[PDB]
Amino acid sequence: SDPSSINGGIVVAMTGKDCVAIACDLRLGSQSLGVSNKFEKIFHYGHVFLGITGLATDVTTLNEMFRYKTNLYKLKEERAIEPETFTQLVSSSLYERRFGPYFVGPVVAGINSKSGKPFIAGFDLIGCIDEAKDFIVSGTASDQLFGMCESLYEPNLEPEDLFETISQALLNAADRDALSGWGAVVYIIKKDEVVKRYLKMRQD
Amino acid sequence: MDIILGIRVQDSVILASSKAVTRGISVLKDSDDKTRQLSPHTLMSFAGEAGDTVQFAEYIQANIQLYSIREDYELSPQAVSSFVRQELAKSIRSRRPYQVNVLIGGYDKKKNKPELYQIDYLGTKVELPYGAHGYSGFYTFSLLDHHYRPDMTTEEGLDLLKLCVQELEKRMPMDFKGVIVKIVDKDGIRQVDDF
Amino acid sequence: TTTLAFRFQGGIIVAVDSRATAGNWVASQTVKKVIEINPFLLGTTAGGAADCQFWETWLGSQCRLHELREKERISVAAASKILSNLVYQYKGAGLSMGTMICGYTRKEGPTIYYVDSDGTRLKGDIFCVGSGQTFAYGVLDSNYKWDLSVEDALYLGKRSILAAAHRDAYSGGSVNLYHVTEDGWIYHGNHDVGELFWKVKEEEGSFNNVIG
Amino acid sequence: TQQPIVTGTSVISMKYDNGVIIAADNLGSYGSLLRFNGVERLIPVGDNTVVGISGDISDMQHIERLLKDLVTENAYDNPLADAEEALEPSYIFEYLATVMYQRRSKMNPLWNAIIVAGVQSNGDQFLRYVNLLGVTYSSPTLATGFGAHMANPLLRKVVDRESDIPKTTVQVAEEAIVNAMRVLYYRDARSSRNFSLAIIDKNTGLTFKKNLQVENMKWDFAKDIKGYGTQKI
Amino acid sequence: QFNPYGDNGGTILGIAGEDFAVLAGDTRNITDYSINSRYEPKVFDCGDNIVMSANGFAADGDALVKRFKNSVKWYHFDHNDKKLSINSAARNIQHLLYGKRFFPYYVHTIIAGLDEDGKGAVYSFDPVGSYEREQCRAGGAAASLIMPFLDNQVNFKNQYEPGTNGKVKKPLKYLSVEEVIKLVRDSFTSATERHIQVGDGLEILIVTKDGVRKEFYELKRD
Amino acid sequence: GYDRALSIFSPDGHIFQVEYALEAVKRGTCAVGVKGKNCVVLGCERRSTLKLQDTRITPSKVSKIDSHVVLSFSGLNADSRILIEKARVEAQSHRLTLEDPVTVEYLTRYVAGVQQRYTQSGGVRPFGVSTLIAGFDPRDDEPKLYQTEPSGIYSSWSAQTIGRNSKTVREFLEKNYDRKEPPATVEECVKLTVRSLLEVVQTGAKNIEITVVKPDSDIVALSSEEINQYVTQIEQEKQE
Amino acid sequence: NNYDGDTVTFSPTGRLFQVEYALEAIKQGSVTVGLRSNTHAVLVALKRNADELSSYQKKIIKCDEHMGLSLAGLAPDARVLSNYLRQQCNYSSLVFNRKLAVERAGHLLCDKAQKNTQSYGGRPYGVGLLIIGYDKSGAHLLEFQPSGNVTELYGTAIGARSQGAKTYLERTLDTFIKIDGNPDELIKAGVEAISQSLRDESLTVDNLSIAIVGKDTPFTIYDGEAVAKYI
Amino acid sequence: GSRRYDSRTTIFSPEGRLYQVEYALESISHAGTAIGIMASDGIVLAAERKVTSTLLEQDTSTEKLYKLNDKIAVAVAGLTADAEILINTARIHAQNYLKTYNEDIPVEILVRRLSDIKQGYTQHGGLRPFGVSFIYAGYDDRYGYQLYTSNPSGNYTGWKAISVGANTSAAQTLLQMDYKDDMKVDDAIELALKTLSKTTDSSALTYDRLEFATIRKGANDGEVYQKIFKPQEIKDILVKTGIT
Amino acid sequence: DRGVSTFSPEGRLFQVEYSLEAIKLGSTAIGIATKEGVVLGVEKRATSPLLESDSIEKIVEIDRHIGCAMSGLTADARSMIEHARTAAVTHNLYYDEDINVESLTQSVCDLALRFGELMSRPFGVALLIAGHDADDGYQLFHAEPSGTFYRYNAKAIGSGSEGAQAELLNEWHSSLTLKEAELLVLKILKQVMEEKLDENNAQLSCITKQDGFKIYDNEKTAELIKELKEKEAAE
Ligand SMILES: [Mg+2]
C-alpha cells in the first residue's frame, strides 16, 4: 500500500578525505516476494553519482529523466554538470510534481571537478535538500542506517578506510530489514578514479 | 487473468500462459491465448484486469508493427521492453491506469541471445533468466531456483516448466485449465501444441 | 436473465428468456433480449437493458455505414470490436453489459463473440450469460455436439432456457428462439415457459420431482 | 451543493373569488437564533404579481435582484411595457421555475421554496409553487414548510376544491390567512409575531400590507396547567 | 448533502385496445406524508395523436414531457410537417432518456396512441431509455397492485374454461373502450383503498383515429 | 491560427493551386506501374544528375505501406513522406479495429481523401504529389494498381505512369499493353516496365529502379545487376 | 470601387458597398407581398422555377404557431435567419411561457444582421424578409433588410418589380386595413397587389404561395390547389 | 483586414516551385561553405566562417559545427539563429528516443524528423521557412557511418561526399574528381581542406577562418568519438596537409 | 487579394459563381423522375484506355431508398456523400424510420455555404439526389454549391447540360414508364458525349420502392443500348 516500501531497498553516502563513497543494496521485491537480486540503485551522469530508493518504477523513470536532462545540459554548457548544480536540478525536478510526487529518496554524491571538494546531498520525495557534511541515508532501513552511520562514522577517513565503514554500515543495516539485502554495491569515488565493489552478504 | 510464466534457456525463451478465462462464477473459456506477437522474434504474454489486458497488448502490437514498417527493421527485445515500460509508467499516473502485467520474451538477432523481460503494471522492469506475475512465482520460484541452469536446452527448459505447472496444479486452489506454451528463438515464434 | 448462443454445423442457435425484474417485483414477462442488429447479425441483452438496447441498435447503424462505405458485409469480428471498443471508452462510468454478438459470414463462417462492459471480447463456440447461466450450461455441455441437426439444436437451446427458467427465480416468462444462417437469421417463435414446461415434462419424462 | 444559513419560514397563500392572497412573516432566522426581525419575504413584481419566498435568505436576495432585473429588461424596446406587453404572473413563474430546475441540475440549487401569486391579463387567478428541486404544482391553497402541515388543512376547509373559489370572498379568505398565521406563531419555533400580507385582486389591484401582528391570542388557560402529571401546586 | 431527486408519488396506467388506446393517471401530487395538490395533471396530449406521462420525480417528469413536445414541434419544422408516428416517438424518447444515462430522469415513462396501421399502441420506458411496445402497463406507486389484476382480467391469465379443468385456456377476446375504462376505474379505485399516495382524482386520456378525448373521475380524498 | 484560403476558384472555374501542384508532379522523376496476371511491378526513374550519392541510405522511391501494399510517387519528395506516414498509421489502425489488413482500394481512398482535404482547408497548400499505389488484397490473388493526384481524385489502372515525360511512356504502354492478355509471368511484366522506362530514362544503369509485388505479402526489390540483364536483353532484340 | 472588397470598409461618402450589393440580391429575387388588417396578416409570394421540369422555389417559412415570414434573395440565408427566429420564439415559450412579440422578433433580426456588417471575414445576409404575426397587440407586418433595418408596416412588397405592388397598397391603404374578420377578402387584396408586379407571366396553381395568421388562425401556408380559389 | 499584407509564404509558382524555399536556397548560397566527406574509418566535417575579424574570439565561437548527441553532429549553412532553433529541437528528439527505447537514435530517424519539421513550414502555418541547410555527420550500429543533407524544402538525401553553402557547384566537382570509396579519414581531411582552399572567396585559407570536426571509430575499442577541432589544432592540420 | 465570402456588384458570391464554372467542365449526369421510379445516368469519361472504367464511381448509394449522381470536381463529393450517409443513418437511429428525400437534400445543402476565413472554398461539384419516401413518392433534387436545391421532374448537369435539358424539355411527360426513362437517359447521354456511348463509358442506375437503389450491370446496360439503337433505326 505504502509506495515507498513496496519494493524496498537502501542507499547510503559518506564523505572522506578527498573522496566520497556511495553504496546500495541490490534487492527488488513485491512486498514479501523477492523478485531481483541485480537491481542497482546507483547511477552516474559524468562524475556526479545519484542513488535512488523507493518505488522502483520511479527510480527507473527518474534515472532516465536525469540522464535526459544532464545530456542536454552538457551539450549547451559544453561541460559536465557538477554535484552542487545537479542537486538543485534534482530538487527542482521533484518539486514540480509537488501534488503528485515520485515516491523516492534520492542521494547525490560526487567531487567538484574544479574545487576538488567532496559533496553529498539527500532529498525527501518532494525535493527538500539535506546537505550534510558527514553522511546521507535513504530507504526502508534508514533508521538502521542512521544508527550505524552515527556510531561508525568519523571524519576525514582515507578511501580504503571509508570503504570499510560504509560497507559495514550498509550490510548490518540491511540485515535488520526484511525488504533490503540480496547483495550490495559500494562506489569509492576520487577526483579522477572510481572503484566499484560488489559485497558478499547473506542472501535471505 | 491468472498465471503467466517465463524461462530463458541457452538459445530460446519459453513463455507459458494459462488457458482459463473466468468471469465470476463460471469459466467461460478454457482455450484462451494470453499472448501477442509484437515482431517476428518478440512475443509478449500478459495478465491483469479484464479488457485492459487485450486492449494494451494490441496497442503495443500495433505500435511495434508500425515501427517495423516505417524503418524496415525489427527493434531489439530490449528496445521493445523499454517502450512497453514507458507506456505502463505513463499509465500509472493516468485518470484510469492500465491494470496489466506482462512478460516479454524475445530473441536478439544482433547479439544472438534470448532475452526475458518482466514488467508489472507500475512500469517495474527487470531482465531475468526466469520470471512470473501474481502468485505464480510463489509456487514455482523455489523449483526454478533449484533446477535452473543458464546452459539448459529447450527440451530441458520444457521439462522444468512441466514440473512448475504440476506444482501449480497441485497447490493452487484455482483451476487454470492448463497452459499454452510458446518458444521464441532465432527461427522465430512457434507453439508447443502438446503439453 | 438467461441468454445463450452456440455454434454448430447448421450455423448458430440463439435462445433467451423473457423475464425482467426490479428486485423481487416482476416488471415484465414479455421482454425482448435478442436485439436484431440487422438481418444478418444478432445480439443478446444481459445486465443493463438500456445499455444493451441503445448500443446494439447503435452498432447496427455503424454496421450499415460500414457496408455503404466498403460495399461489403461487415465481419462479425469487426462488428463485435466496434461495440467492445465503444464500451471500453466508457469503462468505469458504470455501463452494465453482457452480450453475444452472433453472425454467419463467408470468410468467418458461424461466429460468436462474447462482449463485456469490462471491455472483454472473447470468440467462442458456446456462451451463456445471466443469473440463470449455470443451469443452461449444464444442459448444453452434456448434450452439445457439432453435428447436431437444426431441429435438435433449436430444441437444445429451448430446453436449456427452460432448465434455467425453472430453477432461477429471475428467469422465465417465455423463450425466444433464433437460428442464424449465412443468408441471415430466422426467427423460431415465442414459447411460453408455463405451457412449455408441462409439454416438455410429459413428452421427455423429465422434472419427475415436480407434480403435474 | 451548500447548506442554508439565514432562513425564512412558512409562506402561505390561497385563491378567492376575485383574486389571490399571500402572506409570510418578517423573520430571518440563523439556526435557532431569531437573528433578523425586519425581513420582507413578499416581493411584488409590477402591480399584478407577488412572489413569496422561504428558505435561504441570501438566495432570496439574489432572486429578488433577478426579478428587479427582469422588469428592467422587459421595458427595453417595449412601448407596451405598462400595458399589453407587461409582465404576467405566468411569465414570472415560468422564468423562476426554469432557473430553479437548471440550478438543481447543476448540483448548485437556490435553497428556496417559492410561491408566485398574482392575477393574469384576463382576470384569471394565478397561484403556483416551485422549490429548490424545480418541482412545481398548483392548488387552490399553497403553503411552504410548516405552512404545508398546519396552514393548508385550515385553508382547505374554506376552499376544498376548485368550485369553492367563486363562493369565497376576500374578507373570508383574509380571515382564514390571518388565523393560519396565528396558528403558525403558536406552533412553529422558527416564526415571528410580525408579518406581511398581500392581496392581488382583479378589480382593486395590488394591496400590500406591512407591519401586521398576530393578535387575539389564547394564553390564559396556561395558568391552570401545573407540573407534568402528579404535581398539584 | 443535497439530494437532487424526490418522489412525487402518483400512479399511471396505459392500455392498448384493438383500434384505440388509453393512458390514465391519478391527479394527486405528494411529498412524504403531505398532499401538494389534489389536481395536478400528469398525462399530457403531445400532439400528433400521442399522449404521454412521465411518472416519478415530477420535476424530471415535467422536463422530459416539455422536451418531447419540443421534439414534436421541431420534427415538423425539419421534415415538412410530417406526422410523428408512435414508433418514431418511442425511439426519440429513448435518446432523450439515454442522453442523461449518468444523471437520469428519475421517471417511468409511458406513451400511448395508434401505430401506422391504426391499431392501439402503448410503449413503456425505464428511467435510462430501455423501451418496449406493450399491450398493458401500469406505472408508479401502485403499479404492483394493478398489474397482477390486469394480467388476470385483460390477458385472462390463470383462467381456464369450465369443464375442461386446466386443459383449455380462456380465449383472448378483444375488449371495447367501454370495457377497458371499467377496468381502469376499478384498478384505481382498488389502488386508492390500499395505497396512501393514490387518490383525489382520476384523469383518463383516450386516443382514437378521431383524436384525443378526456374523461375525469373522482377518487377518495383520504 | 493561419486560416488563409490559398486554394480558391478562379473566374474560369479553376483552382490554380491544385493545378500548380500538378506542375510540381510534372517536374518529378518518372514513375510507372504495370500489373500482370499474378503480379504488379512498380518502375521508378532516378535522375543521374546526382552522383556521389549513397544508394544504401538515400530514401528509396517505392515505399511499403504495409507488408502487402506499396506506394511510389512523382513530385515533391518532402510532401510524399507525410502521405506515406499517414498511410502507414492508417494501415495499422485498420488492422487494429477491423482485425484485417487494408484493401489496396481502401488505402488509396484514404490517401486520396487526405490530398483532397488539403485542397479546401484554410492555411494549407495542396500536396505536390501524385501516387501509384499497388498490392494485393488479403487472401486475394487479383492484382491491384491505383493512381492518386493533388486534387484528390483516384482511379484503377491496368497500367499507368506519372511524372516527367509520362506522356511518352503512357504512349508506349497504350500500344504495348494488351488487356485481353496481360504479362502472364513476372519476367514479362518486369520486361515491359523496363522497356517503358527506356523510352525516357537515358542510360539503363542505376537510373531504373524496379520493385515486384506478388500475392500474400511477397514484395522484393530488384538489384542493379538483375535490372541490367533486362536492359541488355531488350536492346539486343532491338538491334534487328 | 476601392471600398467594396469587404464589409468592414466605409466609402469616402460613408457608404457600405457590400451591404448595398447584398441589397441588390433582393431586387434580383422573386416578388413577395405582405399586408395586414386589424384581425389578420397575410403573406403572398410569387414562387420562381428554374425551368418547366423544375419545382417552384418555396418562399414562405413558418417560425411559430403565431409567426412566420416570406423571403426574397438568397434562400439559404433565409433558412439561417428563420431558424434563428424559430429558436428565439421557442426560447420565449419555454423559459417565459410567453409568445414572442413580433416587434421584438424584428429587433433580434436587426441585431443579428448588424454583427455581419461590422466584422471582418464575414459577409452581410443576402436576403430580405417579410415577417407577419399575431401577438398580444394584434396583427403585425415587418420588413427586414440585411443592412439591419427592420420596419413595421401596414403593407409592403420586396423583390423584382415590387414597386408596382407597393404603389397599389399605398392607394388601397384605407380599404384593406378595414378588412376585419374576413380572411378571404384580405388575401384577395394581397393577390390583387402582387398582380401589379407581374409581366408576361401570370398566377398559376403551382406558381402562387399564400400564408395567413390572425386572431383565431394559426400561421398556415397554402400551396397547390389550396390557392386555386384565389386565382 | 489583415489579408492585404500577407506574403503567402506557402504557395506554388505557376511553374510548380515554392517561392520561399527557392529564395531561402538563394540565401544559403551566400553562406560560408560547409563540406562533409565520409570515409571507411570515419567522417570529416569542414566549414568556412564568413569574413571574420581579428578581434573575434575564435576559441569560444561556434557558428558552423554543432553537436546533436555523442554520435551525431551537423554542419550549418545559412541563418545561424534559425539553425539553433532546429538544433535544440533535434537534441530533444534524440533524448526522447533514448528515453523511450534505451538506445541511441539512428541517424536517419533524427534526420527525417528535422526534415519533416522544415517541410511543415512550407505547406502550412503561413510562416517563412528556415533559411538553413544542414550536413549531418553521424554513426549508428545499423548503417555505420552516414552523411546526409537537408534544405529548407524539407528534402533530405544521403551522400559519400557533399558540400552546402557557397560555391557548391565548384566544390562538388572537385570532390567528385578526387573521392574514392576505399578512402580513409586522414585522406578525407586533406581533400576537404584542399576543396575549401580552392573554392573560398578569401585570398588565402587560414586557421581563424575555419571550423573542423571528425567522427572517428579511432576511439579506444568498439565505440565512436566526436572531435571538434580547436583553433591550434586546425592550424596544425593546415601545416600538415601543406596549405599554409 | 479579396475576401472569399465577397459579394459582386450584381449581388452574387464570386466563389459560388466560379464553382458553377467548374461544374460546367464536369462530365454529364442526367436524372429522370417517373411514377415507376427515378433513373440516374452518368458519363464516365475515362482520360485514357488503360484506366479501368468500372473503378469510376460517379453514381453512389446514400441509403436503400436514396441514390446520388455527381458532376464536376468529383473528389469534393466524397465528404458530401459521407455526410449524407451519416445523416440518413443517424435519422433512422433517432426515429426508427426512413428519412425524407427533401430532408436529406436539405442536410447536404447546409454544408454548401459553410466556407470562409469551416472549409476554405465552396464545393466544386453538383449532385443529382434521387429517392423515394412514403409522403412525397419518387423525387429528384439538384443540389448546388450555392446551398440551393430545386426539385425536378428531369434534370441534366455537366458539360452537355443546356443541350440535354432542352432535349429533356421536349421528351418528358407525366406518364413515362421506367423502361422509357432508361432509354431516354441513354439517348440524351449518347447525344452530348464526345466519345461513342457504350456499356463501359456510361453507367445507369435507378431507385424503386420495391427493390430500392440499384446500380445497373454493364451487361444489363448493354442490352438497353442495343434496344435503343434498334428503336431509333425503326423510324
Ligand atoms: Mg528472506
Curated annotation (Swiss-Prot), chain A:
InterPro entries assigned to the protein according to its UniProt record, in alphabetical order: Ntn_hydrolases_N, Proteasome_beta_3, Proteasome_bsu_CS, Proteasome_sua/b, Proteasome_suB-type
UniProt-recorded Gene Ontology molecular function terms: endopeptidase activator activity
Compartments it resides in: Cytoplasm; Nucleus
Annotated Gene Ontology cellular component terms: cytosol; nucleus; proteasome complex; proteasome core complex, beta-subunit complex
Gene Ontology BP, a term: proteasome-mediated ubiquitin-dependent protein catabolic process
Chain positions of cross-link Glycyl lysine isopeptide (Lys-Gly) (interchain with G-Cter in ubiquitin): K69
Phosphoserine: residues carrying this PTM: S30
UniProt KW keywords: Cytoplasm, Isopeptide bond, Nucleus, Phosphoprotein, Proteasome, Ubl conjugation
PANTHER family attached to this UniProt entry: METALLOPROTEASE TLDD, PROTEASOME SUBUNIT BETA TYPE-3
Role summary: Non-catalytic component of the proteasome which degrades poly-ubiquitinated proteins in the cytoplasm and in the nucleus. It is essential for the regulated turnover of proteins and for the removal of misfolded proteins. The proteasome is a multicatalytic proteinase complex that is characterized by its ability to cleave peptides with Arg, Phe, Tyr, Leu, and Glu adjacent to the leaving group at neutral or slightly basic pH. It has an ATP-dependent proteolytic activity. This subunit may participate in the trypsin-like activity of the enzyme complex.
Family (UniProt): Belongs to the peptidase T1B family.
Protein name listed in UniProt: Proteasome subunit beta type-3
Native species: Saccharomyces cerevisiae (strain ATCC 204508 / S288c) (Baker's yeast)
Gene: PUP3
Curated annotation (Swiss-Prot), chain C:
Family: Belongs to the peptidase T1B family.
Main location: cytoplasm
Coiled-coil residue spans: none
Organism: Saccharomyces cerevisiae (strain ATCC 204508 / S288c)
Superkingdom of origin: Eukaryota
A single Gene Ontology CC term: peroxisome
Record-level GO BP terms: proteasomal ubiquitin-independent protein catabolic process; proteasome core complex assembly; proteasome-mediated ubiquitin-dependent protein catabolic process
Catalytic residue positions: T1 (nucleophile)
GO molecular function, one term: threonine-type endopeptidase activity
Function per UniProt: The proteasome degrades poly-ubiquitinated proteins in the cytoplasm and in the nucleus. It is essential for the regulated turnover of proteins and for the removal of misfolded proteins. The proteasome is a multicatalytic proteinase complex that is characterized by its ability to cleave peptides with Arg, Phe, Tyr, Leu, and Glu adjacent to the leaving group at neutral or slightly basic pH. It has an ATP-dependent proteolytic activity. This unit is responsible of the chymotrypsin-like activity of the proteasome and is one of the principal target of the proteasome inhibitor bortezomib. This subunit is necessary for chymotryptic activity and degradation of ubiquitinated proteins.
Protein name (Swiss-Prot/TrEMBL): Proteasome subunit beta type-5
Enzyme class: hydrolase
Shown residues within the full chain: 76 to 287 of 287
Name of the gene encoding the protein in the UniProt record: PRE2
Curated annotation (Swiss-Prot), chain E:
Main location: cytoplasm
Single biological process term from Gene Ontology: proteasomal ubiquitin-independent protein catabolic process
Keyword list, A-Z: Cytoplasm, Nucleus, Proteasome
Pfam families hit by this protein: Proteasome (PF00227)
Cell compartments where the protein resides: Cytoplasm; Nucleus
Positions in coiled-coil regions: none
GO cellular component, one term: cytosol
InterPro entries tied to this protein: Ntn_hydrolases_N (IPR029055), Proteasome_bsu_CS (IPR016050), Proteasome_sua/b (IPR001353), Proteasome_suB-type (IPR023333)
Lineage: superkingdom: Eukaryota
Subunit field text: The 26S proteasome consists of a 20S proteasome core and two 19S regulatory subunits. The 20S proteasome core is composed of 28 subunits that are arranged in four stacked rings, resulting in a barrel-shaped structure. The two end rings are each formed by seven alpha subunits, and the two central rings are each formed by seven beta subunits. The catalytic chamber with the active sites is on the inside of the barrel.
Family: Belongs to the peptidase T1B family.
Function: Non-catalytic component of the proteasome which degrades poly-ubiquitinated proteins in the cytoplasm and in the nucleus. It is essential for the regulated turnover of proteins and for the removal of misfolded proteins. The proteasome is a multicatalytic proteinase complex that is characterized by its ability to cleave peptides with Arg, Phe, Tyr, Leu, and Glu adjacent to the leaving group at neutral or slightly basic pH. It has an ATP-dependent proteolytic activity.
Name listed for the protein in its UniProt record: Proteasome subunit beta type-6
From Swiss-Prot, chain H:
Keyword terms, alphabetized: Cytoplasm, Isopeptide bond, Nucleus, Proteasome, Ubl conjugation
PROSITE patterns reported in the protein's UniProt record: PROTEASOME_ALPHA_1 (PS00388), PROTEASOME_ALPHA_2 (PS51475)
Annotated compartments: Cytoplasm; Nucleus
A Gene Ontology biological process term: proteasome-mediated ubiquitin-dependent protein catabolic process
One matching Pfam family: Proteasome_A_N
Extent of the signal sequence: none
Highest taxon of the lineage: Eukaryota
InterPro entries: Ntn_hydrolases_N, Proteasome_alpha, Proteasome_alpha-type, Proteasome_asu_N, Proteasome_bsu_CS, Proteasome_sua/b
GO cellular component: cytosol; nucleus; proteasome complex; proteasome core complex, alpha-subunit complex; proteasome storage granule
Cross-link (Glycyl lysine isopeptide (Lys-Gly) (interchain with G-Cter in ubiquitin)): K99, K198, K230
Function: The proteasome degrades poly-ubiquitinated proteins in the cytoplasm and in the nucleus. It is essential for the regulated turnover of proteins and for the removal of misfolded proteins. The proteasome is a multicatalytic proteinase complex that is characterized by its ability to cleave peptides with Arg, Phe, Tyr, Leu, and Glu adjacent to the leaving group at neutral or slightly basic pH. It has an ATP-dependent proteolytic activity.
Extra remark: Present with 17100 molecules/cell in log phase SD medium.
Family: Belongs to the peptidase T1A family.
Record-given protein name: Proteasome subunit alpha type-3
